[PDB]
C-alpha cells in the first residue's frame with residue numbers, strides 16, 4: 001500500500017493493473033457558463049470537481065500553534081467517521097473519503113461508514129451501474145456502505161450510521177469536504193478527558209465556483225435567532241462576554257450555545273443517553289438547535305476546536321436535493337418544546353404556524369425530558385447564552401402594532417420583513433404584517449417576522465446591528481426617539497420623518513401593545 005505522510009491509509013483507488021479505478025475529467029470547457037453549470041451541479045461546479053484529483057492536497061488552515069501539540073495515537077480511543085449522502089456526486093463524495101483516509105492515522109480510525117440515504121443516482125443505486133460499490137472494492141476494508149431503502153433525511157441517515165458504528169466515539173462529516181491535518185486527534189483527546197463533551201471542528205470553505213480553499217472567518221461561538229436558526233455572535237454580543245473570553249487563544253477549546261452544521265464528534269454511549277436525535281424530525285432543518293438546547297439542558301457540553309479544521313463546499317446558485325416545504329416548520333415546532341415559555345416568542349416570529357408536528361410523539365419527548373431532569377430554557381439563556389439580546393421575556397416589553405391615533409394608522413412593513421425597503425402607514429388590520437417588537441437591550445424596533453431587520457430614522461428597514469445606528473427609546477409619552485439624534489418619529493402627512501421631540505404633538509405619539517406572555521407555552525392543536 002505504501003503509506004506515509006499525506007497517504008496515511010496507503011495508496012487509494014488503485015486497480016490490480018496499477019492504474020486508477022477513477023477516470024478523471026478533462027479541464028472544464030473554456031466557454032462554460034457558471035450560472036448554468038452551478039445549476040446542473042447541485043450547487044457546485046461539477047466540471048471542475050470532476051477534473052480535480054481525488055487526492056487533492058489542501059493548505060493547512062490551522063494556526064501555527066496547533067502544530068506544536070503532540071498526540072499519543074496509542075492512548076487515544078478509536079472513532080468511526082460517518083458520511084451520509086443523498087445523491088452526492090462521485091467526485092465530491094470520493095474526494096471526501098480520500099481526504100479522510102489520507103489524513104487520518106489508521107490507529108485511531110476504526111471504520112468509515114457511508115450511508116446512502118435512498119439515493120436515486122445511477123452511480124449509487126443498487127440496480128444502477130455499480131460504479132460506487134465497485135470503486136469501494138479498491139479502498140481499505142474499513143470503508144463500509146449501508147443504505148436506507150427510502151430517503152429518511154438528515155436525522156434518519158445520521159442515526160443509521162451512528163447505530164452501525166462500532167467505535168466508542170463517532171464523528172459525523174459531510175459528503176463534500178476536505179480535512180486539514182490532525183483534524184481528529186484534538187477531538188478524541190478532548191472527548192477522552194470527559195465523555196459528556198460534544199466537540200465540533202471549525203469549518204473552512206471551498207468555493208463552489210473555483211474550488212479554491214478559503215479560510216473560515218466564523219468565530220467559535222454561536223447564538224440563535226428567534227426565527228430558530230443559528231447565528232454567530234455579533235460584535236456587541238462578544239463584548240458582553242467575560243473579559244478573559246472575548247479573544248481566546250487559537251488553541252483554547254471554546255464553548256458554544258449552539259451548533260451550526262452537523263460536523264461534530266461525540267461519545268456514542270453519551271450521545272444515546274442525552275437523547276441522540278429526535279427521530280420524528282422531518283428531512284432537513286433545525287435538528288442542530290434541538291440537539292444544542294437538549295445537550296446543554298441535559299448535562300452535556302458543546303465545544304468547538306479551532307485546531308480541528310475541515311473544509312466544506314458551501315453550495316451556491318443551486319441546491320443538491322429536495323425537501324417538503326412543511327418539514328422545516330415541523331422541525332421548528334418540535335424544537336420549541338425545549339424553549340419552555342420562550343416558545344411563545346419563537347412561535348410568533350415564524351408566523352404562528354399550525355402544522356402536524358407529531359404531537360403524540362412530542363409528549364413522549366416531554367416525558368423523557370422530565371424523566372431525565374433536564375434544565376429549563378431560562379437556565380439555558382442565563383448560563384449558556386447570557387450574551388443574547390433576550391435573556392428573559394422582560395427583554396421584549398412590546399409586541400404588537402405601532403399605531404398613531406392622530407392619523408388612525410399603524411406601521412406596515414408593506415409585504416417584506418426582509419430589510420432594505422421602506423416602512424409605510426396603513427389602516428390597522430391586525431395581521432402579522434403590522435406587528436413589531438422591541439428588544440430593550442439594543443433599542444431595536446423590528447418586524448415580528450424577522451429579528452434581523454431594524455427600523456431606521458430614514459423610515460426604512462435595514463439589517464440589525466448592535467450599534468447606536470439602530471438604538472431607539474420608547475418614551476413614557478409614546479414617542480419613538482432615536483437616541484443618537486434625540487429626534488422623534490412623526491407620522492405627519494402619512495409620511496415618516498424625524499422631528500424635534502414634543503409630547504404635545506399628537507403626530508409623534510404612538511401606542512405599542514405591551515408583551516405579557518404566559519409562564520407556559522401550550523402548543524397549538526392539530
Ligand SMILES: O=c1ccn([C@@H]2O[C@H](COP(=O)(O)OP(=O)(O)O)[C@@H](O)[C@H]2O)c(=O)[nH]1
Pocket residue numbers: 084085086087088117151152153154157173174175176261262283284315321
Ligand atoms: O435527505 C438528506 C439530506 C442530506 N443528506 C446529506 O447530509 C449532509 C448534510 O446535508 P447538507 O449538505 O444539505 O447540509 P449543509 O449544506 O446545510 O451543510 C450532506 O452530506 C447531504 O448529502 C442526506 O444524507 N439526506
Ligand SMILES: [Mn+2]
Pocket residue numbers: 174176312313
Ligand atoms: Mn454540507
Ligand SMILES: [Mn+2]
Pocket residue numbers: 231232234
Ligand atoms: Mn448578526
